Amino acid sequence: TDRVSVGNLRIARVLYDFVNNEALPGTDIDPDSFWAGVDKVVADLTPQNQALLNARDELQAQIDKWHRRRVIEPIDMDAYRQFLTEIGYLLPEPDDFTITTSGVDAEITTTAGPQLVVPVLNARFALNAANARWGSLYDALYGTDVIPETDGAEKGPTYNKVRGDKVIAYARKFLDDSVPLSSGSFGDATGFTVQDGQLVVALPDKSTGLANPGQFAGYTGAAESPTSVLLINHGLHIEILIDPESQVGTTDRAGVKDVILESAITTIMDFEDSVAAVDAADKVLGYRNWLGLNKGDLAARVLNRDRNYTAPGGGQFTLPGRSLMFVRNVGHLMTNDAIVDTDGSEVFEGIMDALFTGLIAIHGLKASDGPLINSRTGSIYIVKPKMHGPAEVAFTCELFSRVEDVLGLPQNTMKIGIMDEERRTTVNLKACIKAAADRVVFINTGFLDRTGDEIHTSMEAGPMVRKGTMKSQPWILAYEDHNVDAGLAAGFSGRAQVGKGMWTMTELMADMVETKIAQPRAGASTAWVPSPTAATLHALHYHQVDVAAVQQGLAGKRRATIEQLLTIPLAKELAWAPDEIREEVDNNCQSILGYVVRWVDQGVGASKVPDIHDVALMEDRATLRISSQLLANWLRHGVITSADVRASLERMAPLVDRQNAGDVAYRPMAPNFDDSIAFLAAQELILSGAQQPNGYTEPILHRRRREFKARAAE
Ligand SMILES: O=C(O)c1cc(-c2ccc(Cl)s2)on1
Ligand SMILES: [Mg+2]
Fold first, then answer.
1. CATH architecture designation of domain 572-714
2. I want to staple 258 with a disulfide (CB 3.0 to 4.6 A). Which of 241, 273, 422, 527 is the partner?
3. Cysteine sulfenic acid (-SOH) occurs at which residues?
């Protein structure tokens, strides 16, 4: 074949060449000893990796049997919880502690703000995310529905002045609320001056300074009529751009051209649920973009330089122009044929990701060719998804230690962002944080994956409530609060991020601005957004809410009990009219088909996907886990029949077809269903759902995408 032998490993040539030619030079790692390290790490850690995956299985089987041997009305929580304890699912909670993680950048320890997640296989997206640290508020307001397209203020082929004026008024209001003047409002401002280290704002009748002079952070141009004024509020920068000669500036009372907000403070470059990578060629493409980002030479459009300002006093300084990058590795489950052993057995992809994304990240710790791209404090930031419990966390930390040795990095260089998205992590969260107490830089919650796990875990208990209902169930509200509580009690405030989930409705920005404010109000120092535009709008929330104060107020509170966490989301007796059952089935089948068809046919793992009511959603692969699990649960307990499932898939497929009309490379699923690899993938996810380990959709998706790629190669 086309593989390179390195001890017991057989490495795909594309990967071997990529690493030797592009990734290794400049790192001062001996190529030969790097590869020997790969072979030794893979050999040493593979059995523990497999042991952990079998443990998930054995635990799940015991819970399955517990439910099946019982026939009682409601679950006896006391009994249930004692059972989870005996079998090792629920572990004892350790004593209080404070995390000791060190060498972490300010963006993570201190600054509260939006966090972008983007598919690393899409160079354009990744570049846009990296540059999304600063974004135009005017663009974000004019371009979306945050300013209503009421009569007269609608978006046309060209500039609407009525609408522009609403934009301007909106941002004036933001400035008054965020950086208030001593007297009067920015709405009446006439000009900006810097007089002896102090900001002077001219009003029609008088002039005034800031109510808090310290929020003045700097300017550009001459103090006597600056080209911009830089402000700071809750650690986030705001920049007023001054230019009376611009399209918008000409019509403005102070000649203001735009307001620029520091938005995406950090970004997660994603190798997991937002991308489709099923072989060596797909992995190399992702690795190559990750390398381009870290070397700062990725182009598809390039990376921004830092921003230059004059201090208020008159000196000079500089602010980062790029979002600080994390990478999200895949989790413990999947293998990938980018490397096989002599037996033909695929190597664990999570193990490979640590080695290769870790190797590659070394470049971000040094000079691009300009200044060094990423971490100035010398850290590598890796998000590790889908872990179940503190043993799996300890394993990931040991994998990182071993990689650090192979790479010649100081111990604890590789920091860990722990996703709390699996039930066995949730109920043992404190122990999970403790297992990573010297590497952890965040914890984070989310709707989709965690709900998918909830469904699979109690699959045998009975029929679950509908998908839309899940978002307001006691278990999940408790899960959200417990996560914040565990983080703050572990000393995250001032040290590590406490993060919340993605806003998926990309076009519903008015709704996001209205509702997402709940997350920083709950003490989240960060939350996920789908686009640079959403990052700029969500940044508004951090100007309104003092997250640090919120966190300080929550300290010491125990707002969720183990009993609440363990409250299974079972439907009541006879909860749904027949029409309601049908809507939910259609809803879920459309969700699966819509996402699956792009994934299997085009290898796209994230995009704006129209839902059943044509609302544009940007969800990752976890949308598949939840939908397939709910349908599998409804089929399992006799809520619906296999003909209902079939009929819905067939009803939804043409709909998904016409929803993809704009796409030149799209191939329809209807009417030849059993010919469409994608349609068959969607069906398999449902009918085999209950048998997939923890409801994970990767084994099936990966197989079907590989099958599609093979067909197309003929
Ligand atoms: O719903 C989620 O959890 C989620 C959505 C995404 C996205 C990846 C790329 C985008 Cl662009 S949005 O990542 N996680
Ligand atoms: Mg997830």
1. Up-down Bundle (1.20)
2. 241
3. 606
Residue-range domain boundaries for the chain: 1-133+263-571, 134-262, 572-714
- The angle subtended at Cα 131 by Cα 158 and Cα 318, nearest 5°, is 115
Q: From the CA of 689, how far away is ligand 1's center (Å)? A: 22
Indicate if ligand 1 lies below 6 Å from the C-beta of 329: no
Where helices occur in 528-621 by DSSP H, the ranges are: 532-544, 547-554, 562-565, 578-602
Q: What's the one-letter identity of residue 709?
A: K
Instruction: Give the integer Cα–Cα distance in Å for 496 and 443.
Output: 8
Q: Which residue is associated with the tokens 């990052």?
A: 535
Phi and psi at residue 134, to the nearest 5°: -125, 135
Cα(409)–Cα(570) distance, rounded to whole angstroms?
49
Distance (Å, whole) CA 279 – CA 707: 12
Q: Which residues have a catalytic role annotated?
A: 328, 620
Ramachandran region, residue 296 (left: φ > 0; alpha: ψ -120 to 50; beta: rest): left
Ligand of minimum distance to the alpha carbon of 500: 1
Q: Which two tokens mark 619?
A: 């969800």
What's the CATH superfamily of 1-133+263-571? Malate synthase, domain 3 (3.20.20.360)
> Looking at ligand 1, which atom is closest to the CA of residue 118?
9
Q: Is the distance from the beta carbon of residue 417 to the nearest atom of ligand 1 less than 6 Å?
A: no
Q: Is the CB of 502 inside a 6 Å radius of any atom of ligand 1?
A: yes
**Ligand sitting nearest the alpha carbon of 383:** 2
Resolution of the model in angstroms: 2.1
Whether 454 is in the pocket of ligand 1, judged by its Cβ within 6 Å, is no
Q: Give the residue from 562, 564, 588 showing the smallest Cα distance to 473.
A: 564
CB 435 within 8 A of CB 91: no
User: What three-state secondary structure class fits 570?
Assistant: strand
CA distances 374 to 322, 410, 416, 456, Å, are 8, 17, 16, 39
CA of 622 to the centre of ligand 2 (A): 6
- The reply to whether ligand 1 has any atom less than 6 angstroms from the CB of 504 is yes
Give the separation between CA 265 and CA 112, rounded to whole angstroms.
8
Q: What is the separation, in whole angstroms, between the first and last Cα of the chain? A: 19
Among all bound ligands, the one having the nearest atom to the CA of 451 is: 2
